[PDB]
From Swiss-Prot:
Annotated source species: Pseudomonas aeruginosa (strain ATCC 15692 / DSM 22644 / CIP 104116 / JCM 14847 / LMG 12228 / 1C / PRS 101 / PAO1)
Location of the protein in the cell: Cell outer membrane
Residues of the full protein shown: 20 to 127 of 137
Function comment: Involved in the synthesis of the type III secretion system (T3SS), also called injectisome, which is used to inject bacterial effector proteins into eukaryotic host cells. Pilot protein that is required for the proper localization of the secretin PscC in the outer membrane. Necessary for full in vivo virulence.
Full protein name: Type 3 secretion system pilotin
A Gene Ontology term for the protein's cellular component: cell outer membrane
Amino acid sequence: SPKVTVGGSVGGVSLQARQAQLRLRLYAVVQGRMQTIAERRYRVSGLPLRYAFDLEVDRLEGEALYLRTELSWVGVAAVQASAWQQVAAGVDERVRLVRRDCFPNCTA
Ligand code: NI
């Protein structure tokens, strides 16, 4: 089951030592439906963060892929910053977080 890596770095906000989570969801249209095909969460206290999904090429073949990246604070169930972009396998994909207007004090 040969695999290729969809990976890169997440940056673009300063966490300043605050405990955070990054939730990365990889989307693809699978027979015409937009679906999450993979998800990772990372616990971090600074950026940038290097990420990687190792996915079967059989699963990736022919697919547009989209990466949804969401920063939250640990202890607060709310998105503080996020990114949405098309990505491609085997490419170092730079994810640049965009702060919400309510950052860093967004609420659940
Ligand atoms: Ni950075």
